Design a protein around this ligand. Structure first.
Ligand SMILES: COc1cccc(NC(=O)CCC2CCN(C(=O)c3ccc(C(C)=O)s3)CC2)c1
Ligand SMILES: COc1cccc(NC(=O)CCC2CCN(C(=O)c3ccc(C(C)=O)s3)CC2)c1
Ligand SMILES: *Cc1c(COP(=O)(O)O)cnc(C)c1O
Ligand SMILES: *Cc1c(COP(=O)(O)O)cnc(C)c1O
Lengths: 429, 429
C-alpha cells in the first residue's frame, strides 16, 4: 500500500487510541520507518525524518532498531518463537525473571508475566484480593488511590483512574466505586499524608490495597510529587495492614532518574507493575512482581493458585528482547545519561516560563513538561512541531516529551525548541 | 543457563498459568527449541523431539519457525519495530485491517487492535456499552451469555465465564452480575432457544449484549453445539434490540473447519473478537471488530470516541507477522487441509470410545476430544504422552488436541495414539 492507500484504509477501517471512526479532526500521519531517535513520516506526500520526542509513548528508551535489540530478537527467532507456559518453561523467561527480581526494589521475589500494562494491573489487583482471601479477610476487596492517576483501560484499571480524567460521568453505575484521596501535591506537606492516613483508617477493613504511580503521574496529567509521600504510604500501609502496589508501567527502567521511581523514596511495595519500556519498545509485554509473603499466602489459601494465565504468557520473543534491553541499560552508565538529558531538558525549556500562556515548566529525569493555561490545539501544534523536525503529541493543556535515552545534546535542543514554539503559539490566537 | 539452572530460577521466581508458587505437583518441562510441529524438550537431562499437539495453546496454526512468518518478522524489523498509534498510522496496521474486514463475517467494517484476547473482550464490552449510551439508553449495561463459557481473565471478562468453572463463589461480591442461560446443548433443541428468548425478553431493557463463543466452547470444557443455535441468537438479538458479540479468540482462522465458526451458521455478529492464532503463535495480538453502525453511534455520542487505547496498539511487528499468517492460510486450500485433519482425528480417536474410563469422543475441525469419567492426573498423563513422542496437556476430565495445520497424516495418528494411551491409563489408576 502507498501512503495515500494507507490513509484511505485507515479512515475507513482503523480505530486509534481514544478516537472516532469518521469524525477525526485531522488524519493520522503515515509512519514508514523508525531508526534510532528518528521516525520517518509522510508530510505532503514526501518522507521526512523527525525526532520521536514521545519515545513512541514511553516505549523507545534505546531508540528504534537498536542493533543489540534487533539481534536479540533475530537470535531467539531462529531457536524458538513461542511455547505455551502451561507446563513448560524456557531460558528467556528464566533470564528475565532473574534480572527483574535482582533490579527491582528489595523483596519482590516472584514474577507474573502478561501481555500489557492494563492486564498487569488487573493481575496486581487479583493478587491483592486473593491475598486477603488467603488471610480469611474477604471483606478487604476495595482499592484506594489518589487523584490524577492512570492505570490502564480495562474495567478494573478504569476504576482507579482519575474520576475526572477517566470520566466517571459516562461510566457511572458500571465501574467499581473505589476510594480516592485528593490530588497529591508537588511539594512535600506532612498534612497531606496525615489526611491520607485518616481517610484510609476509616476504610482499612474493606481495603485490599493502595495503588499509585510513584513520583510521576503520567497519562493523568504529567504531574510530579515528592518521593517522601511514598515513604509515608509504605508506613501507613504497614500500620493499617493494607497492601501497597506501585504502578511503574511508565516510570520504570531509568525514566525518572532512578532505576525505578520507588528507589527515589527507598521504599518497596508489596506488588509492582512494569510494562511500557520493558522490551525497549519492540513488543507488548508486562510483568507483575510480588513479595514471597504475597505469593505464599495466595498459594496456601483455599484457592491454591492465582487464577490467571494469558495465552502468550512469558512469550520467548518478547522476553528475549526484554533481557537484551535491560542488559543494555544496566551495562552503561545510565544514571549519568539520564542526568545529562534532564539538564538538557531544563536548559532548553527554561525560556518557556516567561511565555504568557505558560503556568509551569517541570522536569524529572528524562521527562519535560510545559503546562499551559488553556487546551493545546492539536491541529495547530502537530504541524508546528513537524516543520521543526519533531514529533510531539500534546494532551489537554500540556506540551511534553519523554525522549529516547540515546538522544544527543543537539537532538534535545531540537526537541525543546519545538516544545517552546508550540507553547508560544498557544498564547497567540 | 543450563536446563537445571532454568528449573531452579523457575521454581524460585516464575508464576505459571493458574499455578502456585512453591506448591506445584509437577515441575514444568524445559523447552529449548521449536520447529514446525515439533518441540525440543529436556527429559532426564536429554533433549527429545515431541509433537506440539496443543499448538502451544491454540496459537501455532502454521507450526513454529515457518519461513514465511520468520521472514515477515525480520523484514518489518528492518524498517520499523514500533511507533505509537496515537496520531500515526502504518502499512502493517492498514494491511491487516483490510484483510480482517474482508474475511470476517459480513458487516464487520472497523478494527480495534489490542495486545491480548482478554483485552479484546473488554474492548467489545466497552463498544457495546458506549453504543447504548450513544443511543441515550445507559440502562442497557448488562451482558447475557450461556453457561460453559470462557472469555479471559480480566475482571469484566471473568464476569461472563462459567460461574462454576470460574469459581464465582471465590469472586462473590467483586464481579459484575451477568445473565446466564443454561448450558447450550450439543444437539439442536428448539425448546432451548425458546427458553433463551424468554429469559432475554425479561432482561432486554438492561442488556447491552449477548456474548458467546460460536460453535465450540474452548477452555470451559471443549463442548460443541449445533450452529443453528447461532442463527437463533442472531434472530433473538435483532428482535429485542440487544447486540450480539462473538468471541472467536479460540475458534478463528480455520480451527473449527470454517474460516470463522460464525460461518457454520452464516451469521454476522455486531462485534467480534479474535486473538490466539492471529499471529500464527509468534506474538501477542488481538482484534475487536464492529459494524459501521456501532462505530458511528459511538463516534456520534457525547464521548465522541471509543475510550480505549493500549500502549502497543497495532504494533507493526505483530501486525506484519499476522498479515503473513493470514495470507499463508488464505493462499492454500485450508478447508481441505482441515477436513483431512478432522478425518485423521476421527479415525485415530475411534478406539477410545470402547475404553472403560471414556464417556465421549468428539471432533470438530482440527479439534479432537476424549472426555473421561474422572479428572485426568497430569502426573501420569504428561510423562505417558512424552514417552509416546507427544506434548499433551489435559485439563479437568479432558484429553484433547488442537494440532498445527501442517501436521502430516502420520503425525496426526501419532498424536491420537498418544491420546488413546493416555485415556487407557486414566482407566488404570
Ligand atoms: C480468573 O477467574 C477464575 C477464577 C477461578 C477459576 C477459574 N477457572 C477458569 O478460568 C478455568 C478456565 C481455564 C483457562 C485456561 N487454563 C489454563 O490452565 C491455561 C491458561 C493458559 C495456558 C497456557 C497459555 O498454557 S494453560 C485452565 C483454566 C477462573
Ligand atoms: C475509559 O473511559 C474514559 C473516558 C474519558 C476519559 C478517559 N481517560 C482520559 O481521558 C485520560 C487517559 C488518557 C490515556 C492516554 N491517551 C491517549 O490518547 C493515548 C493512549 C495511547 C496512546 C498511544 C499508544 O499513542 S495515545 C489520552 C487519554 C477514560
Ligand atoms: C500505559 C499505562 C498502563 C496501561 O498499559 P497498556 O499497555 O496501555 O495497557 C497502566 N499504568 C500506567 C501507569 C501506564 O502509564
Ligand atoms: C484464550 C481466550 C481468551 C483470552 O485470551 P488471552 O490472550 O489469554 O487473554 C478469551 N476468549 C476465548 C474464547 C479464549 O479461548
Amino acid at each position: 500500500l502507498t501512503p495515500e492507500q494507507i490513509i484511505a484504509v485507515d479512515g475507513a477501517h482503523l480505530w486509534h487510541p481514544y478516537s472516532s471512526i469518521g469524525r477525526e479532526a485531522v488524519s493520522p500521519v503515515v509512519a514508514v520507518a523508525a531508526h534510532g531517535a528518528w521516525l520517518t513520516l509522510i508530510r505532503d506526500g514526501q518522507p521526512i525524518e523527525v525526532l520521536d520526542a514521545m519515545s513512541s509513548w514511553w516505549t523507545a528508551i534505546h531508540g528504534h532498531g537498536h542493533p543489540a535489540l534487533d539481534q536479540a530478537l533475530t537470535t531467539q527467532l531462529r531457536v524458538m518463537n513461542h511455547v505455551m507456559f502451561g507446563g513448560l518453561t524456557h531460558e528467556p523467561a528464566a533470564r528475565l525473571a532473574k534480572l527483574l527480581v535482582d533490579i527491582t526494589p528489595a523483596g519482590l521475589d516472584t514474577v507474573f508475566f502478561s501481555d500489557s500494562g492494563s492486564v498487569s494491573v488487573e493481575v496486581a489487583a487479583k493478587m491483592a484480593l486473593q491475598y486477603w482471601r488467603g488471610r480469611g479477610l474477604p471483606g478487604k476487596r476495595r482499592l484506594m488511590t489518589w487523584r490524577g492517576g492512570y492505570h490502564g483501560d480495562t474495567f478494573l484499571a478504569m476504576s482507579i483512574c482519575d474520576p475526572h480524567g477517566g470520566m466517571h460521568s459516562l461510566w457511572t453505575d458500571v465501574l467499581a466505586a473505589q476510594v480516592f484521596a485528593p490530588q497529591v501535591p508537588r511539594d512535600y506537606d506532612p498534612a497531606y499524608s496525615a489526611a491520607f492516613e485518616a481517610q484510609l483508617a476509616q476504610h482499612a477493613g474493606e481495603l485490599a490495597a493502595v495503588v499509585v504511580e510513584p513520583v510521576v503521574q503520567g497519562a493523568g496529567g504529567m504531574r510530579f510529587h515528592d518521593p517522601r509521600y511514598l515513604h509515608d504510604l509504605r508506613d501507613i500501609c504497614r500500620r493499617y495492614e493494607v497492601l501497597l502496589i506501585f504502578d511503574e508501567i511508565a516510570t520504570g527502567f531509568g525514566r525518572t532518574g532512578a532505576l525505578f521511581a520507588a528507589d527515589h523514596a527507598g521504599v518497596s511495595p508489596d506488588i509492582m507493575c512494569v510494562g511500557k519500556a520493558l522490551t525497549g519498545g519492540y513488543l507488548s509485554l508486562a510483568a507483575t512482581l510480588c513479595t514471597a509473603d504475597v505469593a505464599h499466602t495466595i498459594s496456601a489459601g483455599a484457592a491454591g493458585a492465582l487464577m490467571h494465565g494469558p495465552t502468550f504468557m512469558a512469550n520467548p520473543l518478547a522476553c528475549a528482547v526484554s533481557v537484551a534491553s535491560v542488559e543494555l541499560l544496566l551495562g552503561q552508565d545510565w544514571r549519568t545519561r539520564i542526568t545529562e538529558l534532564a539538564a538538557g531538558l531544563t536548559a532548553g525549556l527554561d525560556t518557556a516560563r516567561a511565555l504568557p500562556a505558560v503556568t509551569d515548566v517541570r522536569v524529572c529525569g528524562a521527562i519535560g513538561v510545559i503546562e499551559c493555561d488553556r487546551p493545546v490545539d492539536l491541529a495547530v501544534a502537530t504541524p508546528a512541531a513537524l516543520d521543526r523536525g519533531v514529533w510531539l503529541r500534546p494532551f489537554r493543556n500540556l506540551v511534553y516529551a519523554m525522549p529516547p535515552y540515546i538522544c544527543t545534546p543537539a537532538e534535545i535542543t531540537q526537541i525543546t525548541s519545538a516544545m517552546v514554539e508550540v507553547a508560544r503559539l498557544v498564547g497567540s490566537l
